[PDB]
Ligand binder design. Structure first.
Ligand SMILES: [Cl-]
Ligand SMILES: [Cl-]
Ligand SMILES: [Cl-]
Ligand SMILES: [Cl-]
Ligand SMILES: [Cl-]
Lengths: 360, 360, 360, 360, 360
């Protein structure tokens, strides 16, 4: 159906805030689709994304058939003046938001949740891992208490804990303490957020040999394929990355080099669901697991991980879920399978009233 | 909707015959989907495929929601007793037929042609190349006359000519004659159908250095990645292959080795549209062109090439088109964009009446 | 001598059953040869193999000199309509059965067991490893009791234990318990049946560093060479595979990549003895050991491992041996050397009466 | 000296227009530095860059010592909320403008042209190549006349001609005609602007074997390293690229892979002069020539090429030079060495009056 | 049957002479097997081989079952004191003679020619190439006359011509003259007998670019794998080698490095038929053609090429054929298929009488 309106929006949601920055696209039948990227919720930079949506993309969308999501992806991504200042960064993040909104429309029009629209479920239950208990800012005391709570009270058996102290031996100590505190059958991944260099990572990985580390996410600088490839060969600890990669080309470079074992596409960083599927298919071809980064707090990725056969487990951070018409939900470490039509990107009406910010 | 019947069929269509061997799948709403593989039309081997469909796959399909095409692909592909004698060959070809039928249903239920269902057109016109004028059995005078007719009367600007004489210099002579006869603006690809070894191909490619060969399809043994990689490095002539590869895994091996430049998935050889899309996405990640082999005489591939953004040109062989509810059609070297709901796999009643063969 | 009859057969033998699916080939002198592949004993899929034998291969065999086993291998394997839907899967499994039957005839006509026909014994005793005590379905209690019995009562000093729980630490625990229970001089190989991905295998292999694992069979997806190559470089635990590979080309890809150390051809998966010997010679060239997978429960492989100089040890599963005219036999962990003319593929006459199933 | 103001500006200069989009930075002593990126001059996208400068970077610059250009590069590039939506694209282009402005200030305060500030001249004369005669839009007669005029009347001995027709043989025809028209001592580089795929490029390069092509710029997709590496090995024609690469990391990937011989950093695409120097030093380490792309129409690059010892020749496009206080000037194919203090980025008042656009 | 005698022999046959140096092995049933290596017919070095046979191998053979050819190969090859001074050279050449004799016995006892014993014919006719017209010692006029006679009078369509002048341009001149004289449909391979170094070969191959050279045999030093690999990548001319390689290990090194395309095992250099088959199987795995070198003047290789499916064409040199009970025979460029029981290694009585030399 024809697109009749494209309206950007900015929500600043409490955890200082997570930025949900995106597009509401309306079609002639009254269906409204939502898509968004994720930000640090600084208004002036959020507005660069919304300005791209309203000022650059909206004119390319109005009057077009929203059903043509593949064709429209290319129309926007390859628009010469925009790709000139793009292929990555703010134009690509704005593209992601539009793309997700178009898929939300497709599934809504079909009257089904996105995982069903795409071809059905590949599992009866997508297992979750809890990231929210693992932030680097936590004292050891608080890291331990939250980890224990997640496992002993909330039924998680998979956690992700941040590392990245200047001296990685501090992280060895923290992880050692967590390993002593929780049951051995708890899986523990770690995440360095690109903080360390190759030699630092080599030493840390050797020192972590007995800690049963599930994966090491973003150990090295985001755009440095070779360091990751060298690290992967130097340790048995699996390397995970993808959060920060904007394109299928970047994923191909990392995957083909053996620089990543756990592939982490993100519809808010790549060009939406469209480019996500391309990367997930690339991972499938290599028989590598797809574990997407929660740039949208898993609101979209729950669908993709219920559907795409290379998927395994799914990141859980509960910050924003209750602000959506269909919150993600985890019970005893398993994601509920979505039921509502669309991609569960639709915020509650009150979310705009309470947390919305002016785009201009 | 629930699957209520699965009926295999065999057509032996004249050009000595082309085998259209597949499945008609009916759902509770009365919609009928068709999918098929392509064979040499020998009844006893055709019946191995249909028996797999009726005796092995039908029990796994009846009562299932046809909408769940992704889940059902896995259910059939990974059924233990079947994959034990599978992963390639008969079982995988039967899987392809089923998968295509499920996608035909999906697009029929949506009321749109498959290319539109998938997200819209990536081009206003898919250019064709004529393979039917180039068979190795043609005398030089007939090769010349047909090549010239296709170009000068029928408006093709792209041809594919078979090679594969025991002495490749005979093929050099034939191609030299065609090049002299037709305008220089005619693109001419060639196809060896896996007939030669590496050294033979090295010599031939060097001898063809001035013939402006667009690509060399299946120069070497189908399962030999390394020979293709070595050939690709030894010549500037691009290598095309894929029509004999059964799995995404095989395509990954060839693509990552630099053993193929023109990637040729085939929904009749891979596991249908489902696996085709995975391979096309893999090619996209490498920025390689997707030019599918006409194992279904382009009835399905016309949709996929109109849609998938890595697609370029499309093989044309006119043998069976007139036996379909929506025949492919090429005018002035360009494929007509399909209009009818479905994947244009539905044959006419006359085809079954005149050319249908008993499956048991 | 001329082939006068080709008759497929299906036996379902108790361990729910193992399928012995093959061909009985009769020559003009009254000699009858037997060859077979192995299946899960599901009648409808077994019949695809027998239908290939009767409907496609028999016409190509009747009247031919059975002595010409090499020429006939090519005649069947490369028959255009069949290789079109082959190179792997059901056509290739049917080929294996025919090939083995032809070799059984050759040795029977010569009046000697196959290992002697081929050129004599390379060892005085082929050592066995017991797989039958190691199934993944066994409780730890039963795994321990059977392992202990095999070693302490039955004289095995080599075992193979299955792994592949979703959490490999469960397999670490099981193997740790077995290692504690049996003497240190017991060799223990493991087998994952392609269940895990690369990062999972890396972690498991590191965690198994002190368990003295003899080899790790099929750790990764069967058609994924690169993951196996990366794993092999990441651990000192040797990688074994081949059970699932249909062709010499696939073996070459794995072997040349350093993706396999223990080479496991199988006459029931490859194209019979003919293709087995090619793969064993390929392994010999690389000075790698040949340890064939018991797809025929070692009835044929006992001959090949007594003869081929790259051979080392031999898998033992006792399910079907007593149904043959010359059962394999293991005493104190050593295979008896076969005595009877042929390839010990001939079932007892009563086996057909008791366990035979109609092919049509 | 302390930064007291940061003012973005947008110029749309006629050649349909070239966008000069940047920042004027004022220090407490009244010195004004100018820096800019280059765009297609579409106001709504230009404003994304200026908004980043005013809304995001200005608060990080005001009150800082402009002398600290290295520290300030890092402060802006790594500001967490900005790098989160950056590392490339809009934020990085805005960073480039700021960085160039700070270097302009540095050289102005020193009272010398930038090439002198940096350490003096590596050559008595930087030779130019004329790009402006070679646009793909030119008819053959106009391509010929302009190429000949540049050489025979204006004293150029180096040209760059666009390629990129759908059929590269049209480009072969055009280049053949130019080669026949002009003296053999004229160097002719070509530029495909990322239009073709690997196989197309292989065929074209082989067809251009006798045309004495100096380099082939951007033959392939900008983010595809492997295709460039494979092409570079397949032809003797040198590959040039860099004008679309945003980071030193991307340049390292291409250079180390042997995917580029002529390295083309651009201060308007990389993070200014600061990052340009890093890339030029990387090229120097590989003994590869540095030939920067004219994203700033060589106003800045004339300094960098006069100075950096890996520099060779310099692109010339005359579109905007007359709008600057110190226009580039080429006589007899040689660039004039800049004389005025600064980086020759200061535009004339008339340019703002006639071609300036409102940023908000 | 038990071996009752082992008698070495030396024949110096005229073409200055070719040395046929080997073993006659008698079994208890009176069957006599013959096998031999090929030498330059210098008596004192020939006697080293015969002394190894009589003094070292005979004691290991007497009383053994000749049927056990595989076991006996190992017994002799690995005898510690012998392998200590072996693995190549004299001991291995003597081993070859013994091995061939045992296979001759095997086929004689079976009452069939060796190609039939091994499993039947892979072709209706093995094509020959004439080497005897191409010796480096021939003047150009004699090279021309003989090449033309072979083609125009004797019906050869395949020739091999020696190269190896100090200045390879003399060889270019000779080959150019032959190419001008004979029809273009004549295939012409060349052979340098290890005379040149890598750079010399690179220049020669480039100079031969238009001479349609079928293969370049032994271009480089026999034990230098890397030079061959580098040459093979530098030219389209195929590299052939193997006639100087003693072991399967050496062949594996060359084949896996891409240093050979035409694989040339020789039963007189490798350890007989036994090792030849291993190498032929290795070549088959790589889909490379097997074209054995005539160290036994094709008396044995005619069988192996009629049988082994990787075989293609066969070298022809007529020097010694008339001295055998079953001479090779070539008519119209095709080898006669052997008919007599055995491996056609049995010499005529006259050969011993006229050309036999005392071994002690
Ligand atoms: Cl996982
Ligand atoms: Cl194309
Ligand atoms: Cl072993
Ligand atoms: Cl230069
Ligand atoms: Cl050949």
């Amino acid at each position: 159906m024809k697109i009749t309106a494209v309206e950007p929006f900015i929500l600043h949601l409490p955890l200082t805030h997570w930025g949900v920055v995106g597009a509401k696209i309306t079609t002639s039948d009254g269906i409204e689709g939502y898509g968004f990227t994720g930000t640090h919720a600084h208004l002036p930079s959020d507005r660069l994304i919304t300005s791209c949506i309203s000022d650059c993309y909206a004119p390319l969308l109005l009057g077009e058939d929203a059903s043509d999501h593949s064709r429209l992806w290319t129309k926007l991504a390859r628009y010469p003046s925009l790709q000139w200042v793009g292929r990555a960064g703010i134009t690509h993040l704005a593209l992601a938001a539009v793309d997700v909104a178009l898929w939300d429309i497709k599934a809504k029009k079909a009257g089904v949740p996105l995982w069903h629209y795409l071809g059905g479920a590949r599992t009866a239950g997508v297992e979750a891992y809890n990231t929210d208990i693992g932030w680097l800012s936590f004292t050891l005391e608080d890291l331990l208490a939250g980890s224990a709570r997640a496992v002993e009270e909330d039924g998680f058996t998979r956690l992700k804990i941040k590392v990245g102290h200047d001296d990685p031996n501090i992280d060895i100590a923290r992880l050692t303490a967590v390993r002593e505190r929780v049951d051995s059958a708890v899986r523990i991944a770690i995440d360095g957020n690109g903080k360390w260099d190759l030699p630092t990572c080599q030493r840390f990985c050797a020192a972590a040999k007995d800690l049963d580390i599930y994966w090491f996410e973003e150990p090295l600088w985001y755009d440095d394929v070779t360091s990751h490839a060298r690290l992967a060969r130097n340790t048995s600890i699996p390397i995970a990355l993808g959060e920060q990669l904007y394109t299928v080309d970047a994923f191909r470079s990392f995957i083909d080099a053996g620089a990543v074992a756990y592939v982490q596409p993100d519809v808010t960083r790549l060009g939406g669901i469209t480019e996500y599927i391309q990367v997930a298919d690339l991972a499938l071809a290599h028989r590598l697991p797809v574990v997407p980064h929660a740039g949208e707090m898993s609101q979209v990725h729950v669908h993709l991980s219920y559907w795409h056969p290379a998927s395994t487990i799914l990141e859980y951070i509960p910050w924003i879920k209750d602000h959506f018409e269909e919150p993600i939900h985890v019970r005893d470490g398993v994601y509920k399978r979505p039921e509502q039509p669309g991609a569960s990107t639709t915020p509650l009406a009150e979310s705009f009233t309470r947390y919305g910010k002016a785009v201009k």
